[PDB]
Amino acid sequence: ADYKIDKEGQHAFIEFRIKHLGYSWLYGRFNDFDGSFTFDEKNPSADKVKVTINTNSVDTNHAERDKHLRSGDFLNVSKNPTATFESTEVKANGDSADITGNLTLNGVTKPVTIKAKLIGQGDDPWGGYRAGFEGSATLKLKDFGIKMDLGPASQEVELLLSVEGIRQ
Numbered sequence: 001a002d003y004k005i006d007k008e009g010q011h012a013f014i015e016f017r018i019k020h021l022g023y024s025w026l027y028g029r030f031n032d033f034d035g036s037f038t039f040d041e042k043n044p045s046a047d048k049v050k051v052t053i054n055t056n057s058v059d060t061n062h063a064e065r066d067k068h069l070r071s072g073d074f075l076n077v078s079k080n081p082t083a084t085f086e087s088t089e090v091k092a093n094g095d096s097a098d099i100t101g102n103l104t105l106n107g108v109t110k111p112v113t114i115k116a117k118l119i120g121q122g123d124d125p126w127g128g129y130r131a132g133f134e135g136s137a138t139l140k141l142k143d144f145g146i147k148m149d150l151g152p153a154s155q156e157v158e159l160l161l162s163v164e165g166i167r168q
């Protein structure tokens with residue numbers, strides 16, 4: 001069974017944090033992404049996911065910071081308007097799954113493993129069928145060519161992902 005991520009209902013989130021000066025966590029998100037996934041409980045090998053993210057939609061609730069994040073110093077939105085994650089392997093791992101795939105971010109393509117778990121599923125109030133998932137992953141800024149050094153404690157960004165899918 002194939003699912004479309006609920007973008008219209010905005011039951012889908014890409015949330016991140018990174019330390020500011022190693023003093024506190026700075027929280028942000030991307031407001032504009034789309035994708036789909038195959039969730040097959042009978043044949044879990046068939047499982048796949050693809051997400052496309054418009055990186056100009058970066059949002060840390062600070063206009064000037066977000067403008068700086070859009071620039072060539074950071075996400076370089078003008079050169080690369082989109083980020084893509086497309087799974088290459090979904091492996092069962094205890095009471096969750098490991099979703100390995102290619103992340104292309106800032107023109108660079110490198111593998112990322114998302115630790116993923118089913119949150120809930122079932123028929124919705126409006127007739128449809130839904131399945132929702134949580135994911136976690138981290139990345140090093142330098143691995144995707146993000147030039148500017150933010151200090152020694154700010155090399156990694158932590159990702160918390162939520163997707164609610166509507167079965168097609």
Ligand SMILES: COC1=C(OC)C(=O)C(C/C=C(\C)CC/C=C(\C)CC/C=C(\C)CC/C=C(\C)CC/C=C(\C)CC/C=C(\C)CC/C=C(\C)CCC=C(C)C)=C(C)C1=O
Pocket residue numbers: 013014016018019020021026030037038039040047048049051053055062064065068069074083085090099103105112114115116117133134135137141146150154157159161162163
């Ligand atoms: C004056 O203004 C300024 C400030 O304010 C005062 C500052 O603080 C600062 C300092 C700023 C900082 C310390 C913070 C800077 C923050 C930075 C650099 C972080 C920016 C964020 C990133 C690089 C993250 C990029 C991440 C992405 C695009 C997301 C990637 C997505 C990935 C890997 C996966 C996506 C996949 C999904 C959503 C699908 C998940 C699916 C499932 C779990 C299940 C699927 C189901 C089945 C069944 C398979 C500056 C420079 C400034 O100019």
